[PDB]
Design a protein around this nucleic acid. Sequence first.
RNA 1: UUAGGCGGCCACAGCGGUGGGGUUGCCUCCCGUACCCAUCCCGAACACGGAAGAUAAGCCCACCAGCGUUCCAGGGAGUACUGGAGUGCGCGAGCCUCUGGGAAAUCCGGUUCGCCGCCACC
RNA 2: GUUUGACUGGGGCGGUACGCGCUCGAAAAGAUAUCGAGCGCGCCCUAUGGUCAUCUCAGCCGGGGACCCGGCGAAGAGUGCAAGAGCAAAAGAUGACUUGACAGUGUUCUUCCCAACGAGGAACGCUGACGCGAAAGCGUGGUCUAGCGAACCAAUUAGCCUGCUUGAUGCGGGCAAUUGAUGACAGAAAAGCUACCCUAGGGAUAACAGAGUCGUCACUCGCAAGAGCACAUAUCGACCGAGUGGCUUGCUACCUCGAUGUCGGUUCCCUCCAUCCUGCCCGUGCAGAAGCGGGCAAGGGUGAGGUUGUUCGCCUAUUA
RNA 3: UUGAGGCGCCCAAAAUGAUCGGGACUCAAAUCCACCACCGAGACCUGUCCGUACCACUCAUACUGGUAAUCGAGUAGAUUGG
RNA 4: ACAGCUGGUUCCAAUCGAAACAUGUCGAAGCAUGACCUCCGCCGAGGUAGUCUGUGAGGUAGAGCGACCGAUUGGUCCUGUCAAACUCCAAACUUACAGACGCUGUUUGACGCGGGGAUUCCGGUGCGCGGGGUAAGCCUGUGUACCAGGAGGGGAACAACCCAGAGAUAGGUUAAGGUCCCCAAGUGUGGAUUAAGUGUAAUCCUCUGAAGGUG
Lengths: 160, 186, 92, 95, 154
Amino acid sequence: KPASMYRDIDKPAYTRREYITGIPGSKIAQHKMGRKQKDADDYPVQISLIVEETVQLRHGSLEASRLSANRHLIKELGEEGDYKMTLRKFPHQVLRENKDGMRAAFGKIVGTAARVQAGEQLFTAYCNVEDAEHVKEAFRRAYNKITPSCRIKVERGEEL
Amino acid sequence: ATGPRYKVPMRRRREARTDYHQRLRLLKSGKPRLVARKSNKHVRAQLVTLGPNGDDTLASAHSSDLAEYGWEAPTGNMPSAYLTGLLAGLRAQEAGVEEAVLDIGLNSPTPGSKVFAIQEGAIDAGLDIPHNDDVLADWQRTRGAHIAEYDEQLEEPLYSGDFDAADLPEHFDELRETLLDGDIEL
Amino acid sequence: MQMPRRFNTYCPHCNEHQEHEVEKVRSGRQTGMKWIDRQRERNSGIGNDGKFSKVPGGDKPTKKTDLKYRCGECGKAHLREGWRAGRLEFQE
Amino acid sequence: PSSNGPLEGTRGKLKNKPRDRGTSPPQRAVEEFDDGEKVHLKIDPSVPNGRFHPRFDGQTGTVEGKQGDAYKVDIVDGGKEKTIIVTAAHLRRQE
Amino acid sequence: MHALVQLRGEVNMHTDIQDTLEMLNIHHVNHCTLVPETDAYRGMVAKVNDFVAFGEPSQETLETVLATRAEPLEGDADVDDEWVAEHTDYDDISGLAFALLSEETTLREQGLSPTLRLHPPRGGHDGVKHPVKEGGQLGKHDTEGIDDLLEAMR
RNA sequence: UUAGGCGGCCACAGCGGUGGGGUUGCCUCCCGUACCCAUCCCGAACACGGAAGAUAAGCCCACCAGCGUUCCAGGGAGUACUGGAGUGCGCGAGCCUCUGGGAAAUCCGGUUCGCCGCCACC
RNA sequence: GUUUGACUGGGGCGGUACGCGCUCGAAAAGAUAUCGAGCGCGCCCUAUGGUCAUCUCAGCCGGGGACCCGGCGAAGAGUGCAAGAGCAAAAGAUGACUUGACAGUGUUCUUCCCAACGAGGAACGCUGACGCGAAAGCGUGGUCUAGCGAACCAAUUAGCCUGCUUGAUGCGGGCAAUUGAUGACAGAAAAGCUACCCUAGGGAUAACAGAGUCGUCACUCGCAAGAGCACAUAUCGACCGAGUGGCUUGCUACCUCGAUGUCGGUUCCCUCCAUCCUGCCCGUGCAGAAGCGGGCAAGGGUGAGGUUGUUCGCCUAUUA
RNA sequence: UUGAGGCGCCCAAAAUGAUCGGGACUCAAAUCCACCACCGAGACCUGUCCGUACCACUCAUACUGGUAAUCGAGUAGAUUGG
RNA sequence: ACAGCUGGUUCCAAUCGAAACAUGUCGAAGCAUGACCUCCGCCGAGGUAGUCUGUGAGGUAGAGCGACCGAUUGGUCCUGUCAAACUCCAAACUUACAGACGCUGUUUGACGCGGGGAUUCCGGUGCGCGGGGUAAGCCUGUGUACCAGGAGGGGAACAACCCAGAGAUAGGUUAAGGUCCCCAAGUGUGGAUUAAGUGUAAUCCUCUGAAGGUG
Ligand SMILES: C=C1C[C@](OC)([C@H](O)C(=O)N[C@@H]2OCO[C@H]3[C@@H]2O[C@H](C[C@H](O)CO)C(C)(C)[C@@H]3OC)O[C@H](C)[C@@H]1C
Ligand SMILES: [Cl-]
Ligand SMILES: [Cl-]
Ligand SMILES: [Cl-]
Ligand SMILES: [Cl-]
Ligand SMILES: [Cl-]
Ligand SMILES: [Cl-]
Ligand SMILES: [Cl-]
Ligand SMILES: [K+]
Ligand SMILES: [Mg+2]
Ligand SMILES: [Mg+2]
Ligand SMILES: [Mg+2]
Ligand SMILES: [Mg+2]
Ligand SMILES: [Mg+2]
Ligand SMILES: [Mg+2]
Ligand SMILES: [Mg+2]
Ligand SMILES: [Mg+2]
Ligand SMILES: [Mg+2]
Ligand SMILES: [Mg+2]
Ligand SMILES: [Mg+2]
Ligand SMILES: [Mg+2]
Ligand SMILES: [Mg+2]
Ligand SMILES: [Mg+2]
Ligand SMILES: [Mg+2]
Ligand SMILES: [Mg+2]
Ligand SMILES: [Mg+2]
Ligand SMILES: [Mg+2]
Ligand SMILES: [Mg+2]
Ligand SMILES: [Mg+2]
Ligand SMILES: [Mg+2]
Ligand SMILES: [Mg+2]
Ligand SMILES: [Mg+2]
Ligand SMILES: [Mg+2]
Ligand code: NA
Ligand code: NA
Ligand code: NA
Ligand code: NA
Ligand code: NA
Ligand code: NA
Ligand code: NA
Ligand code: NA
Ligand code: NA
Ligand code: NA
Ligand code: NA
Ligand code: NA
Ligand code: NA
Ligand code: NA
Ligand code: NA
Ligand code: NA
Ligand code: NA
Ligand code: NA
Ligand code: NA
Ligand code: NA
Ligand code: NA
Ligand code: NA
Ligand SMILES: [Sr+2]
Ligand SMILES: [Sr+2]
Ligand SMILES: [Sr+2]
Ligand SMILES: [Sr+2]
Ligand SMILES: [Sr+2]
Ligand SMILES: [Sr+2]
Ligand SMILES: [Sr+2]
Ligand SMILES: [Sr+2]
Ligand SMILES: [Sr+2]
Ligand SMILES: [Sr+2]
Ligand SMILES: [Sr+2]
Ligand SMILES: [Sr+2]
Ligand SMILES: [Sr+2]
Ligand SMILES: [Sr+2]
Ligand SMILES: [Sr+2]
Ligand SMILES: [Sr+2]
Ligand SMILES: [Sr+2]
Ligand SMILES: [Sr+2]
Ligand SMILES: [Sr+2]
Ligand SMILES: [Sr+2]
Ligand SMILES: [Sr+2]
Ligand SMILES: [Sr+2]
Ligand SMILES: [Sr+2]
Ligand SMILES: [Sr+2]
Ligand SMILES: [Sr+2]
């Protein structure tokens, strides 16, 4: 289905699994990536990806982006390069669809999304001053698969 | 103690000195409480009224100042208890107090116990307290017959300092007697 | 809930306390000499009757316990309300 | 609502804050008021008997005599005047 | 002492606000009242902040206005020094004007109508769709600004 | 209050800890079961009677902030949110200005190791 | 001769949101809708009720998943049943006593916010009688909020009133109250077909068409994993993301029910471009020939036939 | 070399005849920041009159005088004079 | 014939002026009882639409959760996220009562009380907050102002957007909005940007334009 159906925030927060059922499983396979044993302070550079508009990101978008995003870093830095990217958000908001007529319209659970207020960090990478351009390119790809426009901001990087 | 959600009992309950659940029932009558409390060596009998910042004591009576009138004997027995009661009963009679409800505190409603024996004295003093006759001890044990007949089982004085060997429950009568006297400085 | 065959209770009579039994109304028959045995033939004839041409109605998923509290020394009884009980046992 | 019972939607108003749990002090379940006195109606979650209909929490009434040990406070619901029977345990002297 | 001036109509304005205005003895657009400065009086103007123009006028202007727009409690009688003196515990406009500002008396306490029915601002005002800060005419004003208007509404 | 009884507020009073305190005084632990009373078994408790001993508990007194809690300073923050107004902006979700209010988390620094009432008493 | 209800994103089918209780929706007083989300009640118990005495629970640790001793332990236990709430020297557990789940009559609130309305319900009094306790006191059922029902008729109960001139006997009329149910739950005893139809009306309400919407459908774009023997980008192209159209479908119920004739076809006229051919172009996995993909472009053209009412589609032979 | 902001450009396909109402406008007749002068209601101010309500006078609800910043829109409907 | 259903019901003016909602109803195209409109009589001094302050009620926004609760990462304590049916926190704000100021009432009698007569119980829109639905000129709440039942001015036309609430007549100044022409008023002033006719379109079914990109 189109993201148009669930990109804005207009329903009440809907996440009480204790009342909701048939909630589809997350398509996300890893929130921690790269060398997840090292640390964030172990790196000079810390570039995160910031969402410019508050929205909802269906897990299919997170994974779709996170994938092609990280997949780049794996390519340009090796399946064991010296980096560690992270996706801090999680798909809590449950999404329904009324699939009859308008009678008894409450839908049936079909997905999960992550509410991300504008200005927040969807992703946060940690790399060495060299691969800083491979991470920026790794985000240029990722922000093409989520709905909002974004900013690639450096949290620690005087090397420029 | 643990965190915010924690619940610490009302002070007087931690201390384990006031039985609020029972207290309430008491406080209801509207009548002053005839507080009866024991002690290893002593026995007190306060007459409390309720107040804006805490209970008020309109009339007490401690077994210690029981000697103040001529008591040369111990201060933690039936004779003692009764008397102390009748003493406070009188003082209270001197404050405008006419009726009260026995507040035996954390003690036990045991038959013939010093408390009921304390309650019996305040009644005799003229006060009006809801009681149960057959729960009070027999006039004699109130006097000290139970103890006198114990020293009969002598061989060794019932007491240390000499009040007397055979003990004088008559003294009980002597003191009680002295209380019904109008003069007596309360 | 059961029901003690003989419990100590009050009664709107002797202003005192004795023993009251427990007996489920055994009711009575149709007199035949009542105001309904006559107007049953007077409110009929040929056709319909309305209340006489009607039939009995159903019941609730339970039946309240209709009683009669007989007395010991006395010998008479009164009437209180009943409770919706599937059954009941006047223990002994 | 979904049901029209007295306690409908009264989770909030009829419940003590954690540290106010358990039995309540007797000092206020015995408080004596004088006819005419203004009092604030507020139910004590810890207290069971002597409660007025929840819908009246927050009302400031005027003691116009008492029934038994309980009081008969006068209040005005919207525009209709009503006589509420409440026990001291659920009352506070105004001002 | 502040000069309250209704600059926005009644249609569509909340009722509790309009009721406040009428409480402040102001019933029509362009009508003006001189309100003290207490907590109570503050709450009211604050609440009317959007359909009014207010501030403290210069003794000068306050006079210019009183002269041109003050009225008895009933009548056409011009409120001029003579009038003022013959009825008010004062001796002339300036005398009155000073008290109002010093907050000693009130147009009513004297026998003047609480309202000063002004005339449309000559040359127009700075608009009723924005405050004074945004370049409009609504809200609190500069003792000079307030005058600029009241002056213009002789 | 050189140690007590009854309380109100019911953690600022909790939790944890250190140090001091008692010859006929107080409170206790304590000594003991003939009686009133007592234990589904126990004088443990409850109840009764009494001082040979003790200040080790308790309790009272002084103090400690590590945990919990109350309030306060500064920082967060006039930020989040928000009552009123706008021919202000934005495709839009939404944002902004003016006016009146205004947090929470957290951090650092103070406070807090109870307060007050009546009665009795070297 | 009549009956055969109502609700309803039209009606039918389905369902019950048709009487009740709880949390959320509900926007920090009160009130608050939808075929709103989660879920219940139509009883059950004579002890599983009442009081008094004694006592403290889950779970955990250590000493000998039964038992026993000690320690930590404000409550996570238990309290009949939904949910929310109350409760620890108790409202929970044990023991014993007890049967107040008693008679009767009221006040108040609720039922029905505000604001009139019955039954039912609750809190709170008084009179009588009881139960427990030393006593204050507690018991008008189970800690609170669900477990409920009018008249008529029948039965039943205490005392009293009364039945046509009159006495006796018999049988009746009545005051007061209990039980038996109407769940469509403020109560009718009660099935269907009608294309043979009929009337009153409705665009208060469906079907064609219009209009809004665009999930669906058609088309595009972004990023470009992947393959294409090597090579993303000759060509193909997933995922995800952004959109355009108003041809499909669905949705809504705004317009029309004192009627806007309903599919397909035909005939005749105008148009759109997202282009099938034709003109001019670019790339090629462009030798040529023949293609494949793309750009500009709507001047012109885009035909005849076999099955099927078919639209669509399948099939034949011609065709630039 | 890199950060930021402004206006604009690409993305951008529909059916009888194109559109900001039209004309047409480019150091503007656009946009943004300021400023000056004007035009423009039945609103506001003002002269006179009318109705209505209230006051004085009055038998009057007939005159006369007075007050209204705080009276003057209205479907269903209630009320009343003609 | 009956109908709760469609149509129609004839002169002037003055005062006030709705309800399209609650409870029950074989009730939903109808009634009844309330709310609300109006008229009459009675009572006789207070009343409370605004604000401020004092004494109270509250768990929505926000926030947070080694504070409960249930969700929800990873690493050898540290680290990553949530909640309509969670809460150690917590507004704005709404709300009871009282005082004060304001306003109002005691010849215009308020507040209140009794009685007669209604209409009404298809609502709609804007805005704020909502719940459902991809959406809707959707369905269904709530507070509020407006349309209905509201002229006049402006917005090209246009119930509800802006100004404005309006006796007659008249002079004047303004409001919204506008000043190149059509068209009353500037081809106004200082300065900058734009080269696309971007634009000359407050709001909107109505005025689109997006992700992405732009020596
Ligand atoms: C409880 C209910 C009972 C009743 O009251 C409301 C009514 O009582 C009834 O209908 N039947 C009864 O049967 C038992 O007692 C009587 C009653 O009347 C019978 C005649 C009937 O009233 C007309 O035909 C009867 C034959 C006189 C019979 O005699 C024994 O109505 C509903 C049925 C309602 C559900
Ligand atoms: Cl004691
Ligand atoms: Cl039976
Ligand atoms: Cl009540
Ligand atoms: Cl051919
Ligand atoms: Cl006339
Ligand atoms: Cl008006
Ligand atoms: Cl042009
Ligand atoms: K038609
Ligand atoms: Mg019948
Ligand atoms: Mg709530
Ligand atoms: Mg005047
Ligand atoms: Mg002008
Ligand atoms: Mg203007
Ligand atoms: Mg020591
Ligand atoms: Mg806009
Ligand atoms: Mg129907
Ligand atoms: Mg009902
Ligand atoms: Mg509420
Ligand atoms: Mg029967
Ligand atoms: Mg019904
Ligand atoms: Mg017909
Ligand atoms: Mg329609
Ligand atoms: Mg035709
Ligand atoms: Mg083309
Ligand atoms: Mg052509
Ligand atoms: Mg053919
Ligand atoms: Mg007329
Ligand atoms: Mg007239
Ligand atoms: Mg929240
Ligand atoms: Mg109409
Ligand atoms: Mg001109
Ligand atoms: Mg254009
Ligand atoms: Na269906
Ligand atoms: Na006959
Ligand atoms: Na409490
Ligand atoms: Na046994
Ligand atoms: Na010691
Ligand atoms: Na039927
Ligand atoms: Na009733
Ligand atoms: Na579209
Ligand atoms: Na369509
Ligand atoms: Na055709
Ligand atoms: Na062509
Ligand atoms: Na064919
Ligand atoms: Na009319
Ligand atoms: Na008919
Ligand atoms: Na109806
Ligand atoms: Na009807
Ligand atoms: Na006043
Ligand atoms: Na919010
Ligand atoms: Na309606
Ligand atoms: Na209006
Ligand atoms: Na117009
Ligand atoms: Na143009
Ligand atoms: Sr929504
Ligand atoms: Sr994007
Ligand atoms: Sr007959
Ligand atoms: Sr027959
Ligand atoms: Sr049934
Ligand atoms: Sr011993
Ligand atoms: Sr728009
Ligand atoms: Sr869009
Ligand atoms: Sr401030
Ligand atoms: Sr038929
Ligand atoms: Sr249908
Ligand atoms: Sr109860
Ligand atoms: Sr059949
Ligand atoms: Sr046929
Ligand atoms: Sr070609
Ligand atoms: Sr077709
Ligand atoms: Sr086919
Ligand atoms: Sr084209
Ligand atoms: Sr008029
Ligand atoms: Sr009129
Ligand atoms: Sr009017
Ligand atoms: Sr509210
Ligand atoms: Sr010019
Ligand atoms: Sr210029
Ligand atoms: Sr863009």
